[PDB]
Amino acid sequence: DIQMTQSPSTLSASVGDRVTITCRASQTINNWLAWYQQKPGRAPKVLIYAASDLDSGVPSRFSASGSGTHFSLTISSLQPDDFATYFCQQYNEFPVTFGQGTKLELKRTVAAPSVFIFPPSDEQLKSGTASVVCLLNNFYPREAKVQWKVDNALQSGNSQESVTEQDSKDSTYSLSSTLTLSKADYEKHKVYACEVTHQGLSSPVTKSFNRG
Amino acid sequence: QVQLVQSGGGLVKPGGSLIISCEGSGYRFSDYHMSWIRQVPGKGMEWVADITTKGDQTAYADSVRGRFTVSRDNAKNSMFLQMNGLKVEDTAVYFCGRDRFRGGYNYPSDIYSHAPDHWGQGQLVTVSSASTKGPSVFPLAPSSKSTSGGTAALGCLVKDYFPEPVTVSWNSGALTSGVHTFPAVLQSSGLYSLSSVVTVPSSSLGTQTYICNVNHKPSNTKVDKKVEP
Amino acid sequence: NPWTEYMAKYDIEEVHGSGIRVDLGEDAEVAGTQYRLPSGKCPVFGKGIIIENSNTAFLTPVATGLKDGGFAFPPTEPLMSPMTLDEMRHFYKDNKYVKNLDELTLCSRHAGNMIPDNDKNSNYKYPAVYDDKDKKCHILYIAAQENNGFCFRPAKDISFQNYAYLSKNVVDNWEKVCPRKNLQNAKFGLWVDGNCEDIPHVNEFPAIDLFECNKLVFELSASDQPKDRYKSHGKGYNWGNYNTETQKCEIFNVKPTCLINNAAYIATTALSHPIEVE
């Protein structure tokens, strides 16, 4: 049972840069390695077979080498389309095993988020539940910390984050932190503040509202 | 051109059975070894089964052998995966692959291992004893706390739905740039929730209407909720 | 003899009819001069050409203006070699006599429809190699196999393992009338007096695994190389009984007429794939 180990799992780079993706096996797989590209929500596209042969139509900037236990996929001059996920496959034996993948992502300049806060709708409160949403819009890098405060009291375990993929044009990220309370708990407090800490912000920003 | 089109994905309760399809066109279907590969959502790929050109010989991963059965009908340009006794651990997106690239040999099995050159679009197979539930759609109203610098951020919240997916559009496709439909989050209740936001000009918040078109095909839900301040 | 019809495909002298190590069993005219030409009727699985003292694979296109390139057809317009199976089937879509052909037979026919040096009145048809690595048919410009008195020799190698050397005469029903896969728990024998007996005169060479035995049998197999003279017509040491338990390769040059059910043996032929076993 051959274990493919693909490293690094995440690789940030700028356009025009050379990147290499290493994929290694616990035992010899001879030369039966294939490389694939997968965009989010789309089927994989084959790049390399036999560890060094390009499929028809693959751009010449793609190239690969290796044999035995050491394999590497190289992109000589990145283009905006190339930023995607890549994984290797070994087809020397059954079971066929894959690499866990490498997420290649673009490297842009720091960008502060646009922070917005949305109170729960009257329609939802009529159902006994209240959801307070905080929106961080078009920021970079991806790292960001969102702390919920209700009447200046920190909240823990009752918020869930979600982050979009890097924008096809901005190269930015967007995040939603949703605070889910009951109707009873929501009507006991008055001030709901969303605090964001990010690299592009000199000091933490706070967007808030008063119930009513 | 070469196409691999799949069908049959859906929600199955544990211990149940499902049949997935893979129909090929643009080539002679009988010429190619084929594979079934599943991608556990968020994780990496995992090989499921292989079938030879004539269908004589089959190979299966340890985790599915005895439960899954791959078969093909080259006259119909079709391949099938019969999944029986499904477990929650089988929940993943199942791809079919046309295996043009031949690799290593397996003795005494008499089957070669292959790498695909074309993949199907994928079908999501969800195994869970939970019941399909249509979403609730609540508006994220454009306020003064959402207006900033001549643009306003509005959205709508799709809450408490199972199983994935949901498909949110805006003004029936008029707004396509700046749309951020976030990934779904599984909640403590076992249901999913999702948000979608667009950025609109502030001047038109009263003049024009903004409508988010949510879709949940498993529950046959197709809603149009207007977001207003 | 109840083995007559089953063993017909191991009558290599009949179902192949030409050399295996070196296949030059026919002659053809190209602009007056007469040249030699592969003419075997069965695929030769696992066969390639080693370019002694060269890092150039023999499927590299020939030098286009010798050391630099290999044996394969040079690039053309439209491109004819290499051509994938999907490309071949589409290219001959309107041809009725291609619809029921298979990938190996199609490669041989595609190579055979190439004009030699602008002589349309010539029965010279180039040989070819089909690579299962990517289902590509490589037309061979150089139809020579051995020159080791640019020095090269034919052999079976781990790298030549998805290849299949195809003459112009490969039959469309090679799937039934030619040897491809070796036989598990079977030993070649001669039907004598109503029972299958051992081959009377064989040469036993040590061979660590089945691959080495098949490589040996190929090396001693029928060779049309100069020393209609120098034409084997398929006669040679084309058969091998491999003892898996003792690691012994038992080679002989007489056609087998039955099979012995021995659990320690694998029956191989020079035409057979060096690894595949039913």
Side-chain angles (χ1 to χ4, degrees), chain A residues 55-69:
Chain A
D55 186 18
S56 179
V58 178
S60 49
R61 61 183 171 275
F62 286 92
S63 53
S65 70
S67 62
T69 48

Side-chain angles (χ1 to χ4, degrees), chain A residues 32 49-50 53-54 91, chain C residues 87 133-134 136 158 162:
Chain A
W32 303 125
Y49 62 91
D53 279 315
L54 275 74
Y91 57 118
Chain C
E87 285 175 341
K133 176 182 74 180
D134 41 27
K136 285 183 184 181
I158 192 74
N162 294 15

Side-chain angles (χ1 to χ4, degrees), chain C residues 118-182:
Chain C
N118 300 274
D119 192 354
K120 296 183 172 180
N121 302 271
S122 168
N123 49 292
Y124 191 111
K125 295 183 184 180
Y126 292 95
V129 180
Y130 185 89
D131 189 0
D132 279 295
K133 176 182 74 180
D134 41 27
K135 284 182 157 50
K136 285 183 184 181
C137 177
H138 302 265
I139 303 176
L140 286 174
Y141 189 83
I142 299 173
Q145 289 91 346
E146 185 187 349
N147 176 39
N148 58 30
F150 206 65
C151 294
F152 54 89
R153 55 180 181 79
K156 296 198 171 177
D157 200 300
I158 192 74
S159 54
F160 298 162
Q161 198 149 95
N162 294 15
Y163 296 172
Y165 196 90
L166 301 160
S167 297
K168 65 175 190 72
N169 296 333
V170 173
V171 309
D172 61 84
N173 61 103
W174 70 263
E175 298 113 322
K176 304 291 185 176
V177 310
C178 292
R180 178 185 173 184
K181 292 181 176 180
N182 312 282

Side-chain angles (χ1 to χ4, degrees), chain A residues 36 43-44 46 89 98, chain B residues 2-6 20-24 27 29 31-38 45 47-52 70 72 79 81 94-101 114-122:
Chain A
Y36 300 87
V46 71
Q89 179 187 325
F98 298 82
Chain B
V2 177
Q3 288 177 353
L4 291 172
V5 175
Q6 297 179 233
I20 306 174
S21 306
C22 179
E23 191 169 352
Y27 67 102
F29 197 78
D31 281 341
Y32 289 85
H33 201 91
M34 299 203 75
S35 291
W36 281 103
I37 309 168
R38 65 187 184 186
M45 293 285 178
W47 169 76
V48 181
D50 267 12
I51 188 168
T52 65
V70 65
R72 65 191 300 165
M79 172 177 59
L81 183 65
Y94 287 76
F95 296 88
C96 61
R98 197 190 73 165
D99 285 337
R100 168 153 70 98
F101 313 122
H114 296 72
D117 63 338
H118 283 96
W119 297 61
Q121 82 271 16

Side-chain angles (χ1 to χ4, degrees), chain A residues 110-115 136 140 145 195-206:
Chain A
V110 178
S114 301
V115 186
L136 287 61
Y140 185 95
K145 187 182 191 181
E195 184 180 34
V196 175
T197 308
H198 188 243
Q199 177 184 349
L201 302 178
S202 55
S203 61
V205 166
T206 312

Side-chain angles (χ1 to χ4, degrees), chain C residues 1-277:
Chain C
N1 190 330
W3 292 94
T4 297
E5 299 183 5
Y6 174 87
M7 296 294 293
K9 63 179 181 174
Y10 302 112
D11 194 354
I12 294 172
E13 182 183 345
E14 181 72 34
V15 305
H16 189 57
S18 184
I20 304 169
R21 174 195 164 87
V22 172
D23 181 356
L24 297 172
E26 280 186 6
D27 302 330
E29 184 209 52
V30 188
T33 302
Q34 207 91 10
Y35 297 96
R36 305 194 64 175
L37 176 75
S39 60
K41 296 183 290 186
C42 286
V44 187
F45 295 95
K47 174 178 181 177
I49 301 174
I50 292 173
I51 314 200
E52 295 160 285
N53 323 135
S54 210
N55 315 275
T56 308
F58 91 108
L59 291 184
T60 290
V62 296
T64 51
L66 186 60
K67 64 193 172 184
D68 317 301
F71 285 49
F73 211 73
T76 50
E77 179 55 16
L79 190 71
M80 294 289 110
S81 161
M83 188 181 295
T84 61
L85 178 64
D86 283 11
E87 285 175 341
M88 281 189 295
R89 288 194 185 281
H90 169 78
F91 180 73
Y92 299 113
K93 60 181 188 177
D94 292 318
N95 187 338
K96 297 175 175 166
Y97 295 90
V98 168
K99 297 167 184 174
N100 292 342
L101 292 183
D102 56 72
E103 60 193 354
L104 289 181
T105 310
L106 183 58
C107 179
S108 171
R109 302 291 178 272
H110 171 66
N113 292 331
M114 300 300 300
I115 298 166
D117 308 325
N118 300 274
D119 192 354
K120 296 183 172 180
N121 302 271
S122 168
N123 49 292
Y124 191 111
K125 295 183 184 180
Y126 292 95
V129 180
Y130 185 89
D131 189 0
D132 279 295
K133 176 182 74 180
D134 41 27
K135 284 182 157 50
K136 285 183 184 181
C137 177
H138 302 265
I139 303 176
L140 286 174
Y141 189 83
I142 299 173
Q145 289 91 346
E146 185 187 349
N147 176 39
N148 58 30
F150 206 65
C151 294
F152 54 89
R153 55 180 181 79
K156 296 198 171 177
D157 200 300
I158 192 74
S159 54
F160 298 162
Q161 198 149 95
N162 294 15
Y163 296 172
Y165 196 90
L166 301 160
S167 297
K168 65 175 190 72
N169 296 333
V170 173
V171 309
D172 61 84
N173 61 103
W174 70 263
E175 298 113 322
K176 304 291 185 176
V177 310
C178 292
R180 178 185 173 184
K181 292 181 176 180
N182 312 282
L183 309 179
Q184 183 70 63
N185 300 329
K187 177 163 69 168
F188 285 141
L190 303 187
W191 196 253
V192 172
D193 195 8
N195 178 66
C196 195
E197 311 290 355
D198 286 354
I199 309 302
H201 299 294
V202 311
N203 291 338
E204 307 188 30
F205 303 93
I208 295 173
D209 56 1
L210 175 62
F211 175 89
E212 295 298 333
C213 183
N214 188 254
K215 186 157 69 182
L216 287 175
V217 177
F218 178 89
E219 290 178 19
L220 309 178
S221 72
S223 179
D224 302 342
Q225 189 77 354
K227 307 190 299 180
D228 288 324
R229 188 169 284 95
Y230 310 112
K231 290 186 177 178
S232 73
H233 297 108
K235 302 165 174 288
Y237 292 81
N238 309 324
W239 301 269
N241 296 326
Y242 181 59
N243 189 323
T244 69
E245 293 189 355
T246 70
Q247 296 180 325
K248 292 286 201 164
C249 183
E250 308 182 357
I251 310 182
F252 55 98
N253 58 10
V254 301
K255 67 171 180 176
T257 56
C258 58
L259 287 182
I260 302 166
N261 187 40
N262 194 323
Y265 273 92
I266 295 170
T268 181
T269 63
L271 297 177
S272 297
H273 196 279
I275 285 176
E276 298 177 14
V277 171

